[PDB]
Design a protein around this ligand. Structure first.
Ligand SMILES: CCCCCCCC(=O)OC[C@H](COP(=O)(O)O[C@@H]1[C@H](O)[C@H](O)[C@@H](OP(=O)(O)O)[C@H](OP(=O)(O)O)[C@H]1O)OC(=O)CCCCCCC
Ligand SMILES: [Ca+2]
Ligand SMILES: [Ca+2]
Length: 140
């Protein structure tokens, strides 16, 4: 068991871009010796591989159910966003050590189940926030 993450999507027509609302995560894997992790989420539109299109949340220190409530924005047209698969990666912050990898999940059309469904519902219903839970399982 390594938890799940509540993600929100909404394409704003007046602003022209995608709003990814990271709400929280629950029941994550304990990556530290104290029994916790220090989770923070990383968002990244995959096929660009350009650094001008990726974000990350603030470091929630010592919590297995972090409460982020952080929105991020990607300036991209609606036709160009249909090509994108937004990657999500939750990590554990170590203060004198490379960050432990907790989990991850990717939202795209080539994916299956709830990922393609969430991306698609984001693509169709605009000026409309769609929320969904996502199980971490990438092992990257
Ligand atoms: C260009 C030639 C001259 C320049 C020399 C350049 C030579 C060369 O090619 O190395 C570049 C390489 C790139 O490392 P790399 O891009 O993966 O560094 C991470 C990357 O930038 C992520 O995007 C960051 O996360 P984010 O942005 O926050 O999302 C992360 O920061 P943080 O999240 O951890 O804080 C970074 O750690 O760095 C090394 O030397 C390690 C390989 C050692 C090789 C060992 C193999 C034996
Ligand atoms: Ca750790
Ligand atoms: Ca830690």
């Amino acid at each position: 068991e390594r938890g799940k993450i509540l993600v929100s999507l909404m394409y704003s027509t007046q602003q022209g871009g995608l709003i990814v609302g990271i709400i929280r995560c629950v029941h994550l894997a304990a990556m530290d010796a104290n029994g916790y992790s220090d989770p923070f989420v990383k968002l990244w539109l995959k096929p660009d591989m350009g650094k001008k299109a990726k974000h990350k949340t603030q470091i929630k220190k010592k919590t297995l159910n972090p409460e982020f409530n952080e929105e991020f924005f990607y300036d991209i047209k609606h036709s160009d966003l249909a090509k994108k698969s937004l990657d999500i990666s939750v990590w554990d912050y170590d203060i004198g050590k490379s960050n432990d990898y907790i989990g991850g999940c990717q939202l795209g059309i080539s994916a299956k189940g709830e990922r393609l469904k969430h991306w698609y519902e984001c693509l169709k219903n605009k000026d409309k926030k769609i929320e969904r839970w996502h199980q971490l399982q990438n092992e990257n």
